[PDB]
Amino acid sequence: SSLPVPYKLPVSLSVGSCVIIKGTPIHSFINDPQLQVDFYTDMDEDSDIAFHFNVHFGNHVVMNRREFGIWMLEETTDYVPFEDGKQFELCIYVHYNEYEIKVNGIRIYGFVHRIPPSFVKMVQVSRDISLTSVCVCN
Amino acid sequence: SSLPVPYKLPVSLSVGSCVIIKGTPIHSFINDPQLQVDFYTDMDEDSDIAFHFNVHFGNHVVMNRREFGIWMLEETTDYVPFEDGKQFELCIYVHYNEYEIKVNGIRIYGFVHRIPPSFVKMVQVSRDISLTSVCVCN
């Protein structure tokens, strides 16, 4: 892996930013690998999370947020267009009202902001992947 | 322009980071346009500058740094492989001992760190360009 995992990246996010994550699952899909992305409001892992994203490859995605230290109401989708054993490109685009999640160019979900995305100061990419690159673009 | 100019981007830089700047000069080369990139240590424009970069299109590049508010010894190169009127790609790659400057895939200079690049908290892109995109990658 080009970058260590858990990869904790300090970020500054604004409307129009894109977080592009490129990596490869480290286990085949029959082994139920996961990929987790957390939009943290501080480098401390107990800080609030504006957007939590856990892909269960070949299964579903679970999304949530943590406010005043409390996990809020979980959201899910079954649209998991990741391919077994291949590199993926995961793009999280910050619109004025939501994070748009695109997997390999395919939009799968729009997670609405309950706090402004400019409150995000760290993005952590974790779990069962090898990372080739992470870019924050505007 | 997709992004306003002067564009002041909060950043976090580490060894292995790449700053990729894509834009177009807003004047023809006979009009002596410039492109300036400042690696600032804080959002305040009077803060120290780890790496200052001013392209005089069709002419030369001037580089310097500002320490304790004082401009240090200026460095220059004549290698300015920008094309008149075209979009450029300016990549600044942070190695352990230097910033590598690549213009349109062409390495033109290596500006050695006199403070650690992790001290850079803001990158400002300014002067005679229209910006299509700025990405910070690892």
Numbering used by the authors:
A (entry chain A), B (entry chain A): 2 to 139
Q: Mind quoting what the paper says about this structure?
A:
Galectin (Gal) is a lectin that binds to β-galactosides.
Aside from R53H, the double mutant R53HR55N also could co-crystallize with Tris, but not lactose. It seems that Arg55 plays a role in stabilizing Tris in R53H. However, the hydroxyl groups from Tris could not be merged with the oxygen atoms of lactose.
